[PDB]
Structure formats: C-alpha cells, structure tokens
C-alpha cells in the first residue's frame, strides 16, 4: 500500500497546507469543539494498530499491538462521543 | 488492493469535509457526522488488508477500547469535556507509539529515512501520551491543578529531551532492544516533566498542543509504514492543531512558548 517518495511528499505538503488553511477564521466558541473533532480524526490511528496486530508473530508483538488497538479504539469512540455532545450546544432545548 | 485504496480515498474525503464543516457554526453538527462515516469505513476496510491474522484479538481489542471509552464519554458532566479530550488524545498518541515500537522491534525498516520517521513519530506520540495523561489527572482531581515547580526544572527538562533525542538518533546506527526500550521510557518521562509546571487555566493550550503532536505522530507513522489513512488524517490534524493551539493562546491572552516553557 505504499506510494512513491515524491508523490508522498506532495501529499504531505498539500495536506499540511490544507489543514492549516481550514482553521483560519474559526470563531472562538468553536475552539474546543474543533480540538475535540480533530482529536477524533487522528483516532484513525486504530487502523494502523490493526495492521500491526494483524501481522504480529510473537507473544510480545501481539501484546503491544493488542494494547495499541485498545488505545486507538478508545481515541476514536470516546473522541466521537465527546464531539457529538459538545456540538449539541449548536441547537435549542426539547 | 484497489478496493482498500478506494476505501481510504473515500475516508480522506469524508475527514476533510468533516473538518471543514466543523470549523463553521452553521455546518458544525453535520461535520462530526461526515467524519464518523469516514472512521467506520476506515476500520471496516482494514479487515481486508493482505496477510492479516489474529482476527479474534483485533475484534476483542476494538470492542474493549471503544465500549469503555463510549461508556465514559456519555456519563461525565459536560463541564468535564476538556479533560476527556485530554485522555482520548493521550491514548491516540500511545497508539502511534505502539506502531513505532513493534516495527523497531521487528527491524522492519530497510530504509534509514523511513526508520527516522518511525522514530520521530514514536518520540512525539510518547510525549503526548504521558503529557495528556498528566493534563487529565490535573483537571480531574487525581492530582492538584496547581503548577509543580522545583529547583533547576527548566534545565532538567532540557537535559532529558536532549538525551531522548540522542538515544533516538543512535537507533539509526544500532537498534538493540535495550536502546529501543530506553528511548520510549525517556520520551514517556519527558511528557510527564513538560506538563508538571502547567497550571489549571493554561491547560487547554497544552492539551491543544498535545493534540497537534498526536496528529503529527499519527502522520509520521503513516508515511513510515505506507498507510494513506494515517498519512492524510494525521498530517491534516497536526497542521490544523498547530494553528488551533496558537489561536487559543491569543484568545486566552498569551503565548504558546510562555505556557509550554
Ligand atoms: C452526512 C453525509 C455522510 C456521507 C457518508 C458516506 C459513507 C459511506 C461509508 C460507509 C461504510 C461502507 C462499508 C465498507 C466496505 C469495505 O470494506 O470496502 C473495502 C473492500 O472490502 C476491500 O476489499
Ligand atoms: C452504524 C454503522 C455501521 C456499523 C458496522 C458493523 C458491521 C457491518 C458489516 C455488515 C455488512 C454485511 C455484509 C458484509 C460482508 C462481509 O463482511 O465479508 C466478509 C469478508 O469475507 C471478510 O473480510
């Protein structure tokens, strides 16, 4: 699943310019909900820990990969739930 | 593996549209939803990766992590969301660190440059792990919120960072198991050291900064192991988080340098 060096390098700078630019002009009241939403996105680290656990051959590799999938899964699920709760604050009162 | 590439392509788009929509008040609620679909598709696609085993371990770990995290998120008072961001952030940084540790232990890198990337993501993920745990413990009550100051702390912290970086670099020449374990333990200790002097009111900035760090770590692991889902999402959040930390500092009347050192 690897891309070449130069293509990967383009992908790195373009995504970096992009992430920076999408946050200019965020209003102050969205600072913490955005931190939380962006926190949930880097949650996708669970996937890379899945591949590690999935190729692990020894007890140690398995144990370290097992722990990473838990940690990754926690970031994704808890980060999702927290962000959903904060963004209820962009509604009224039923 | 065109279908996994296609899936990951779709995930990056959903995260980008999600992030964009979260930055504006009128579309913010919908933005977490687009992002959530991306995460579901990423996890689903990943079971089809070539050569995967340990499917029961994987599924068990996914379930343990996500149920307990979900269970904690929905039961805490709303007033407690900044600390919950911290602990979930810490955990992701830990997850990047584990990817780097296993690959360094396997000696999986034939390329020196891909090795360096794996090493850098491991330092940064580790620091964010213990750094984010201290931020949580301080705001939660497990520790007091006040600065923990001492004789010659700045110099101690710098000396630990310098030593963490020397031992990390040395792995490019000799990757003995003892050196690996020592590098991680020193990066973990540094996360602790760095957050100790930070008081309660300054802690949102530090947490934003560790958020940026985990993103970067996730991105770096992505490039090192050749996973596009992590390359894009990690780089996107690293960059967005870096700026977001500057903005939070300016709004809270301060500098990032002032809080962090
Ligand atoms: C608000 C708007 C939101 C728009 C959401 C659109 C998202 C759909 C993805 C849902 C999950 C689909 C299941 C993925 C199946 C899969 O695994 O594909 C890879 C393939 O298996 C490799 O061999
Ligand atoms: C709400 C969000 C969604 C939650 C996702 C929960 C699981 C969905 C899969 C259901 C789809 C049923 C058909 C899928 C076929 C399949 O999984 O293929 C097995 C494959 O051979 C092995 O890699």
Coordinates of C-alpha atoms in Angstrom, one line a residue, chain A residues 19-50:
Chain A
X19 CA -5.3 21.6 7.5
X20 CA -3.8 24.9 8.4
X21 CA -6.0 26.8 6.0
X22 CA -9.3 25.2 7.0
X23 CA -8.8 26.6 10.6
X24 CA -8.1 30.3 9.8
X25 CA -11.2 32.3 10.9
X26 CA -12.6 29.6 13.2
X27 CA -14.6 31.7 15.8
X28 CA -13.6 31.4 19.5
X29 CA -16.7 29.5 20.5
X30 CA -15.6 26.6 18.2
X31 CA -12.1 26.4 19.6
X32 CA -12.8 23.5 21.9
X33 CA -15.3 21.6 19.8
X34 CA -12.8 21.7 16.9
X35 CA -10.0 20.5 19.1
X36 CA -12.3 17.6 20.0
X37 CA -13.4 16.9 16.4
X38 CA -9.8 17.0 15.2
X39 CA -8.8 14.7 18.1
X40 CA -11.5 12.2 16.9
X41 CA -10.0 12.2 13.3
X42 CA -6.4 11.3 14.4
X43 CA -8.3 8.3 16.0
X44 CA -7.9 6.7 12.7
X45 CA -4.5 5.5 14.2
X46 CA -6.6 2.4 15.3
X47 CA -6.3 1.2 11.7
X48 CA -2.5 1.2 11.7
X49 CA -2.6 -0.6 15.1
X50 CA -5.0 -3.2 13.5

